[PDB]
Amino acid sequence: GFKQDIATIRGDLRTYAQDIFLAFLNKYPDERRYFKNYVGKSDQELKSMAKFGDHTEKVFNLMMEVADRATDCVPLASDANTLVQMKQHSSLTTGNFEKLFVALVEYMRASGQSFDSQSWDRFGKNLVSALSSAGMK
Amino acid sequence: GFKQDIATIRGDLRTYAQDIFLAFLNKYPDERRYFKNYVGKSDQELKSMAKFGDHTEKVFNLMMEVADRATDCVPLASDANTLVQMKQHSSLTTGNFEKLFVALVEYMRASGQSFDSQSWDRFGKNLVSALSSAGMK
Numbered sequence: 001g002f003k004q005d006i007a008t009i010r011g012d013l014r015t016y017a018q019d020i021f022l023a024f025l026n027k028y029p030d031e032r033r034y035f036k037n038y039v040g041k042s043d044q045e046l047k048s049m050a051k052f053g054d055h056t057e058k059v060f061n062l063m064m065e066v067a068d069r070a071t072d073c074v075p076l077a078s079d080a081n082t083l084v085q086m087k088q089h090s091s092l093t094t095g096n097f098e099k100l101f102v103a104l105v106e107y108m109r110a111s112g113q114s115f116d117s118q119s120w121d122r123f124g125k126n127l128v129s130a131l132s133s134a135g136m137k
Numbered sequence: 138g139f140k141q142d143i144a145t146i147r148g149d150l151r152t153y154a155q156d157i158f159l160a161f162l163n164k165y166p167d168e169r170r171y172f173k174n175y176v177g178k179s180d181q182e183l184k185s186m187a188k189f190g191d192h193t194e195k196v197f198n199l200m201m202e203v204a205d206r207a208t209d210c211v212p213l214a215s216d217a218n219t220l221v222q223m224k225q226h227s228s229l230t231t232g233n234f235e236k237l238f239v240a241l242v243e244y245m246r247a248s249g250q251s252f253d254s255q256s257w258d259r260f261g262k263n264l265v266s267a268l269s270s271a272g273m274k
């Protein structure tokens with residue numbers, strides 16, 4: 001289930017983080033405009049960029065912490081607040097998070113692992129609800 | 138589902154509030170001690186008493202508002218705080234609440250009306266967690 005999936009991802013975090021984020025950026029290539037130096041590169045060229053692996057692992061480290069503190073796929077409001085008030089997220093709206101979770105759920109359903117992809121879908125929708133409550137447009 | 142159940146209960150709130158509260162007291166008779174004015178009265182005698190119907194509906198009105206504001210049966214931290222810090226709930230521990238929800242779920246499963254009882258069980262478990270957090274021993 002959801003709680004086990006957190007353990008699975010954490011068990012090979014940088015691999016899952018890069019693969020899921022790549023799924024996101026491939027599904028929604030115009031999302032790369034929020035990042036620097038990601039456009040014009042294949043998957044193997046992003047993976048050999050140092051910043052890409054490091055940053056993307058930090059993103060999923062935090063995502064897993066937010067998932068782990070949730071109850072029944074409902075994140076803490078303090079965690080939503082953090083994600084809204086991060087300088088690095090100042091250009092974002094909740095739609096950017098919706099796209100991320102659509103791609104993440106799609107990746108899980110295509111994978112060879114026994115993920116609880118409906119729970120990740122509930123978590124994404126609940127996180128978008130919480131980001132809205134915390135004042136993200 | 139759970140939202141429909143809130144609608145069902147609200148539609149005939151005096152009736153459900155009184156029936157569920159009496160199911161609670163009749164399953165856990167020792168709990169009647171907290172309601173000094175209800176000692177020594179049958180189900181049918183309590184209903185003729187103004188503050189019985191009026192305070193029991195207020196109890197269940199608040200329960201429904203907490204239920205309605207919940208996400209995926211997880212109540213708001215602020216609503217848990219309200220229930221802990223009511224003068225009327227000063228002596229209570231979380232076990233009192235756990236007994237109420239055991240009785241409420243039993244009532245739902247016994248009824249002719251079609252309730253999402255495992256969701257109420259979950260809600261109760263999540264409310265007890267939140268109450269503890271908010272300082273109820």
Ligand code: HEM
Nearest residue numbers: 031034035036054055058059062063088089092096097100
């Ligand atoms: C729950 C979802 C998300 C979590 C937990 C999250 C977490 C993070 C963390 C921890 C950083 C800092 C990375 C570092 O400094 O190394 C970061 C930076 C950033 N995030 Fe997110 N993020 C999430 C969703 C998004 C989405 C959906 C977008 C855009 C589509 C986004 C855009 C950015 C940008 C532009 C930066 C700064 C640029 C960069 O690190 O290269 N975030 N986020």
Ligand code: HEM
Nearest residue numbers: 168171172191192195196197199200225226229233234237
């Ligand atoms: C989610 C669960 C509950 C909610 C929403 C709730 C709500 C309330 C509300 C709104 C009142 C004020 C009634 C009024 O004065 O009109 C009240 C009073 C009271 N409650 Fe609770 N209650 C809950 C659970 C419990 C439990 C589990 C106990 C004890 C086992 C308890 C014991 C009392 C007592 C002794 C009073 C004072 C009697 C009265 O005011 O009529 N309640 N409750």
